[PDB]
Design a protein around this ligand. Structure first.
Ligand SMILES: *C(=O)CCCCCCCCCCCCC
Lengths: 163, 544
C-alpha cells in the first residue's frame, strides 16, 4: 500500500518515526519495535491467542505467571472470533490503518531477520502477525483491571456435584 | 506509579512541569517501550507505550505532557447469584429461574510424546458475564455463585482514546478529548502544559450505579473489603443508564473526579481524595473514589510538595533519585528507642546497630539497616493496635505514625517482631550493601539496582523476588519522564530503566540499565535540532 516510513534512532535505540499517514506511521512503529522486541511480542501474541500449551505444553506459564492451559482457556474465551470482529468493526479508519501498518512493519522485520537482534530465530512460534493479533493484545490489556484479574477463577468455575 | 504535575504558581519558571514515574513490569506484555511519532503538520508526540500498541501511552508534545497511574476505582462488578433451589445451573432474577449459558473452547496441548491433544473446556455464563470461583471465598455451591461484569469488555474506544490524547494541544484540550470519549480503561491521568495548568483526572471506564441503589444493591460483607459486588437476583441492581455516558452502563464524565489547579496535583495510586489537600475531592460513588488512608509514597510526595517555595525540575528528579524510605519516618524513631531500652540484649544487637547506622535509604550504598527494616515492617504490618497515633481522617498526611511502646503488650509484641526479623536476616547469607543484594540480571552479569518496595514508601518503587543468592527486580520504575517547557521547545529528561530491548543480543539490552544503576537520566530528544545534535544518530527509510 502506502507503507512507507522514515526512521531515525537516537542514543539508546530510541526510534523517531516520520510518515505521511497512519499506515506508514504504524509501518515504522512495527518495524522498529520488532528490531528490539520481536521475540517478546511473538510470545505475548501466543499467550493472547491461547496457544501456549500448543507450543510449550501444560507444564509452563505465561509472563503473567498463569499456567499455560488455564491461560489458553481464558484467552480463547476472551479473544473469540466474534469479539475480535466486533472490536475491529468499531475502530476508526485512522486506528485500523495504524494497526495494519504495525503488522506489516513487524512482518517486514521478521522477513529480513538474521538473528542480529533476535534470540528466538527459527522457533516455530516466531511467526508473521495479523491485525487480529494486535486486537488480541489490546483486549488482553483492556481487561487487566477487570476479568483479567479473575482469569484463574473463570477457569475454575464448575457447578457443584453430588457433595 | 507516581505522578506530579506542577503549575505556574509553584514552578520556578512560572510554566508547567510534569514528573512521570509509572511503576510497571520489567518483562512481558506490559513492558514499556520508547518512541517518538510524527506525521508532519498534524501529529508530533514522544513517550513510551505498551507492546503491540501503535500509539504513545505516556508522553509529551510541543505544549503538553501527560502520564497515568492505576486508579482505585472499580472497573468491574461481581454479581452474587441466587441459584434456583432445584437446579444449581439456573439462577433467579426477580424470582424467575434463568438458565446459565455455556460457551465451550477447545485448546491444543503438546503432550509428553510431542503430539497435540485437544482439550475442551466449558465456560458458564450468566446475563452479567462469566462465573468465577475463588475457593473458600466465592464458591459455586447449591445456594449461590458469582458472575463478573467487566466494564471494559465493551470499551472499543481505547486505542482511539490514546491516539486522541497524542493529538491534544494543552491541558484544556486533553480534558475535552478524554471526557468526550471515555476510552481510558483503568488509570488516572495527570498532565501539565506550557501555560502552567496542572490537571488531575480520575476519568476512566467505571460501572455506573445511581447513588440511591447502592445501600440495597451492595453485598455488605464484600464491599466492606473493597470488592465491588452487587446483588444479582434483583434486576434493579443492573448498571444504571445515562444518555451522557459514552457507553451503556458506565459513569458519565461529569460524575468522575477532575482537579484543575495552578499549584500542583499528585497521585501515587491512592484515590482522588488528596490529589491536592488544599482542595480535597469528596462526594463520589464508592465505586469511584473513597476517603481512605493514603500510602507512604503519597505522604512522602505531599511532605515534599506542600509549602510555597518554587519547585525546579531538579527537585522532582531528586524525589525519585533520593531513594528515601519514607515508612522509616513513621517507625524508626521509636524503633531506635526500643533498641536503647534493650541494650545488651544479644539477639537485638546487630539489628539495632544496622538500623542506627542506616541512611534511611534504598541507595546502592545503603547499609543492611534497610533489610532489617523491611523484615521488621512485614511483621509490624501484622500487629493489632501497635501504632502510637492511628489513622486520623482530619490528619491524613501525618497518620498513622509512631509505635505505642507505652502499652506493655505492644512493646512486647514489637520487640518480638524485631528479634524475629533479625533472626531471619542473620540466617540468609549476607557478608554488604543494598546494591549487593538487589539486581537485574543481564546475560550472565548482574547490575545493581537502586530503589525499594513502594509499600515501604520509596518513591523510586522497585519490586524484587528472591532468586538464588539475590533479589531479582521484576517491576517498578520503568519509563521516567520529566518535562518542562522553555521557549525553544519541550525539555524532557529521563530513562527507560530496563532499556529498549528485551533481547540479550541487542545493543540496547542493558545500556539504560547501566545508567539507571548510576541514576544518570538523559535528554529525551524531541525537536529536529535535538535529534540532529545526537552523535549516535542513525536513519533508515523503508517501504513496501
Ligand atoms: C502505575 O500505577 C502504572 C501506570 C501504567 C500506565 C499504563 C499506560 C496506560 C494504560 C494503557 C492501557 C491500554 C489498553 C489497551
Amino acid at each position: 500500500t502506502g507503507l512507507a516510513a522514515d526512521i531515525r534512532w537516537t542514543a539508546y535505540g530510541v526510534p523517531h518515526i516520520r510518515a505521511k499517514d497512519e499506515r506508514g506511521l504504524g509501518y515504522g512503529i512495527g518495524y522498529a519495535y520488532a528490531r528490539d522486541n520481536a521475540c517478546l511480542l511473538a510470545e505475548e501474541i501466543v499467550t493472547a491467542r491461547g496457544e501456549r500449551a500448543r507450543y510449550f505444553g501444560s507444564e509452563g506459564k505465561s509472563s503473567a505467571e498463569l499456567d499455560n492451559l488455564p491461560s489458553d482457556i481464558f484467552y480463547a474465551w476472551l479473544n473469540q472470533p466474534e469479539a475480535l470482529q466486533a472490536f475491529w468493526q468499531a475502530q476508526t479508519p485512522a486506528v485500523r490503518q495504524l494497526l495494519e501498518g504495525y503488522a506489516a512493519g513487524f512482518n517486514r522485520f521478521l522477513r529480513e531477520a538474521d538473528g542480529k537482534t533476535t534470540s528466538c530465530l527459527g522457533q516455530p512460534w516466531l511467526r508473521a502477525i495479523a491485525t487480529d493479533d494486535l486486537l488480541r493484545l489490546t483486549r488482553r490489556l483492556l481487561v487487566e483491571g477487570g476479568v483479567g484479574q479473575f482469569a484463574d477463577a473463570l477457569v475454575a468455575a464448575a457447578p457443584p456435584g453430588a457433595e | 506509579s507516581n505522578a506530579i504535575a506542577v503549575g505556574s504558581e509553584r514552578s520556578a519558571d512560572g510554566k508547567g512541569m510534569l514528573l512521570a514515574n509509572p511503576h510497571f513490569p520489567w518483562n512481558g506484555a506490559m513492558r514499556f517501550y520508547q518512541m517518538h511519532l510524527t506525521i508532519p503538520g498534524r501529529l508530533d508526540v514522544m513517550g513510551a507505550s505498551l507492546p503491540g500498541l501503535p500509539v504513545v501511552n505516556i508522553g509529551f508534545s510541543r505544549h503538553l505532557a501527560w502520564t497515568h497511574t492505576v486508579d482505585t476505582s472499580s472497573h468491574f462488578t461481581l454479581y452474587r447469584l441466587a441459584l434456583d433451589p432445584k437446579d444449581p445451573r439456573r439462577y433467579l432474577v426477580d424470582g424467575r429461574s434463568l438458565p446459565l449459558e455455556e460457551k465451550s473452547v477447545a485448546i491444543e496441548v503438546r503432550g509428553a510424546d510431542g503430539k497435540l491433544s485437544r482439550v475442551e473446556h466449558k465456560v458458564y455464563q450468566s446475563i452479567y458475564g462469566p462465573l468465577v470461583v475463588w475457593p473458600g471465598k466465592l464458591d459455586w455451591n447449591r445456594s449461590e455463585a458469582y458472575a463478573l461484569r467487566d466494564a471494559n469488555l465493551e470499551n472499543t474506544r481505547v486505542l482511539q482514546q490514546w491516539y486522541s490524547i497524542n493529538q491534544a494541544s494543552d491541558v484544556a484540550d486533553l480534558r475535552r478529548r478524554v471526557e468526550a470519549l471515555q476510552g481510558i480503561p483503568w488509570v488516572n491521568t495527570l498532565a501539565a502544559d506550557e501555560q502552567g495548568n496542572a490537571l488531575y483526572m480520575n476519568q476512566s471506564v467505571v460501572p455506573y450505579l445511581k447513588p440511591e441503589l447502592i445501600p440495597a444493591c451492595a453485598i455488605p460483607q464484600l464491599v466492606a473489603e473493597g470488592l465491588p459486588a452487587l446483588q444479582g437476583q434483583d434486576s434493579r441492581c443492573a448498571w444504571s443508564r445515562d444518555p451522557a455516558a459514552a457507553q451503556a452502563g458506565i459513569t458519565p464524565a461529569a460524575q468522575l473526579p477532575v482537579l484543575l489547579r495552578r499549584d500542583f496535583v499528585q497521585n501515587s495510586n491512592d484515590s482522588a481524595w488528596l490529589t491536592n489537600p488544599a482542595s480535597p475531592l469528596q462526594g463520589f460513588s464508592p465505586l469511584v473514589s473513597q476517603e481512605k488512608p493514603i500510602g507512604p509514597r503519597a505522604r512522602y510526595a505531599l511532605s515534599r510538595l506542600q509549602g510555597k517555595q518554587p519547585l525546579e525540575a531538579k527537585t522532582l528528579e531528586e524525589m525519585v533519585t533520593a531513594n528515601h524510605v519514607f515508612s522509616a519516618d513513621q517507625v524508626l524513631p521509636d524503633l531506635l528507642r526500643l533498641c536503647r531500652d534493650n541494650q545488651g540484649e544479644k539477639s537485638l544487637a546487630r539489628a539495632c546497630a544496622a538500623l542506627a547506622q542506616w541512611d534511611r535509604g534504598a541507595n546502592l550504598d545503603s547499609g543492611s539497616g534497610f533489610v532489617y527494616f523491611q523484615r521488621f515492617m512485614q511483621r509490624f504490618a501484622e500487629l493489632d493496635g501497635a501504632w502510637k497515633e492511628p489513622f486520623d481522617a482530619q490528619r491524613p498526611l501525618d497518620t498513622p505514625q509512631g509505635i505505642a511502646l507505652d502499652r506493655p503488650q505492644v512493646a512486647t509484641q514489637v520487640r518480638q517482631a524485631l528479634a524475629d526479623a533479625a533472626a531471619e536476616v542473620e540466617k540468609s547469607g549476607i557478608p554488604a550493601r543494598w546494591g549487593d543484594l538487589q539486581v537485574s540480571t543481564r546475560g550472565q552479569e548482574r547490575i545493581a539496582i537502586p530503589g525499594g518496595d513502594g509499600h515501604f514508601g520509596v518513591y523510586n518503587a522497585i519490586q524484587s523476588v528472591r532468586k538464588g543468592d539475590h533479589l531479582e527486580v521484576v517491576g517498578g520504575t520503568s519509563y521516567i519522564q520529566l518535562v518542562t517547557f522553555p521557549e525553544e521547545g519541550p525539555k524532557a529528561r529521563g530513562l527507560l530503566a530496563f532499556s529498549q530491548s528485551s533481547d540479550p543480543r541487542s545493543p540496547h539490552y542493558r545500556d539504560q540499565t547501566e545508567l539507571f544503576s548510576r541514576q544518570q537520566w538523559q535528554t529525551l530528544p524531541f525537536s529536529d535540532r535535538q535529534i540532529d545534535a545526537d552523535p549516535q544518530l542513525q536513519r533508515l527509510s523503508i517501504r513496501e
